[PDB]
Design an enzyme around this catalytic site. Structure first.
Site, short mmCIF file in Angstrom:
data_model
loop_
_atom_site.label_atom_id
_atom_site.label_comp_id
_atom_site.label_asym_id
_atom_site.label_seq_id
_atom_site.Cartn_x
_atom_site.Cartn_y
_atom_site.Cartn_z
N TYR A 7 0.79 -1.23 0.00
CA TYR A 7 0.00 0.00 0.00
C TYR A 7 0.83 1.29 0.00
O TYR A 7 0.29 2.37 -0.23
CB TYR A 7 -0.94 0.02 1.21
CG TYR A 7 -2.00 -1.06 1.18
CD1 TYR A 7 -3.12 -0.92 0.38
CD2 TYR A 7 -1.88 -2.20 1.96
CE1 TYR A 7 -4.11 -1.90 0.35
CE2 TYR A 7 -2.85 -3.19 1.93
CZ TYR A 7 -3.96 -3.03 1.13
OH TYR A 7 -4.92 -4.02 1.12
N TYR A 57 -4.96 -0.12 9.49
CA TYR A 57 -5.69 -0.02 8.22
C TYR A 57 -6.60 1.20 8.24
O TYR A 57 -7.05 1.65 9.30
CB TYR A 57 -6.41 -1.33 7.82
CG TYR A 57 -5.43 -2.44 7.50
CD1 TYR A 57 -5.01 -3.34 8.47
CD2 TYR A 57 -4.88 -2.54 6.22
CE1 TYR A 57 -4.09 -4.34 8.17
CE2 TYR A 57 -3.96 -3.53 5.91
CZ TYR A 57 -3.57 -4.43 6.89
OH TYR A 57 -2.66 -5.41 6.60
N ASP A 90 -5.40 11.95 1.63
CA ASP A 90 -5.78 12.03 0.23
C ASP A 90 -7.19 12.60 0.09
O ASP A 90 -8.09 12.25 0.86
CB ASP A 90 -5.71 10.66 -0.44
CG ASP A 90 -6.47 9.57 0.29
OD1 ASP A 90 -6.25 9.38 1.51
OD2 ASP A 90 -7.28 8.87 -0.37
N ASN A 128 -12.79 7.12 4.18
CA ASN A 128 -13.07 6.09 5.20
C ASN A 128 -12.16 6.15 6.44
O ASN A 128 -12.50 5.60 7.47
CB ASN A 128 -13.12 4.67 4.59
CG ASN A 128 -11.79 4.18 3.99
OD1 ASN A 128 -10.89 4.97 3.68
ND2 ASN A 128 -11.69 2.87 3.80
#
Length: 196
Positions: free
Chosen positions: A20, A71, A98, A119
């Site tokens: 990631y 996460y 982001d 999220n």
């Protein structure tokens, strides 16, 4: 604890793992990692707060840095207990993330507002409220609503990456204003950034 709107906690949002690290959803990690290197702040394992964190001097101010390792959608499980433990009010927190609603190479400092579909922010605002500052790092939006995961978990093409990298570099130069509590000036100077 924190003091007024002198920024003393800077959080970068992202996902853990090499798979990631280069993805758009890790824009916040990029900013905070670069900031830590600029000021010589060690980012070290912080298992108590499910993250990697550091503490050091930025321009004469004691500042903490945090990368949740939860996460993205569980980011609050790091940010919330960390900020509570160190008695850091939201008004002294900057969260870099982001931003789908802005172009690569566009960057803005925002105070308040919702999660805008993000999220990570979605997991933080319910707990500490909205009154923290955000460094919104534009990453662009994909073709439609369905493609969001594929976009944010994608590695940007070189031109878009260059645009983001330039905007991030600009923002690094304005952190001095933020840790000094000069949020209005920082907002003016960050938001005015153009890539070319």
């Amino acid at each position: 604890g924190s003091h007024m709107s002198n920024i003393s906690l800077i959080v970068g949002l992202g996902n853990p793992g090499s798979e990631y690290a280069q993805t758009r959803h890790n824009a916040g990690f990029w900013f905070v990692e670069q900031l830590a290197d600029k000021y010589g702040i060690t980012l070290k394992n912080d298992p108590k707060f499910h993250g990697i964190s550091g503490r050091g001097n930025i321009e004469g101010h004691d500042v903490r840095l945090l990368l949740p390792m939860t996460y993205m959608n569980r980011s609050g499980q790091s940010v919330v207990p960390f900020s509570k433990f160190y008695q850091i009010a939201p008004e002294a927190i900057l969260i870099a993330h982001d931003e789908l609603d802005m172009n690569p190479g566009v960057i803005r400092l925002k105070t308040g507002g919702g999660h805008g579909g993000h999220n990570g922010l979605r997991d933080i605002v319910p707990h500490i409220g909205p009154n923290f500052h955000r460094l919104r790092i534009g990453i662009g939006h994909p073709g439609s609503k369905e493609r969001v995961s594929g976009h944010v978990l994608g590695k940007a093409p070189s031109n878009e990456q260059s645009l983001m990298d330039g905007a991030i570099d600009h923002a690094l130069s304005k952190v001095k204003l933020l840790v000094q509590g000069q949020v209005p000036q920082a907002m003016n100077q960050i938001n005015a950034y153009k890539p070319a």
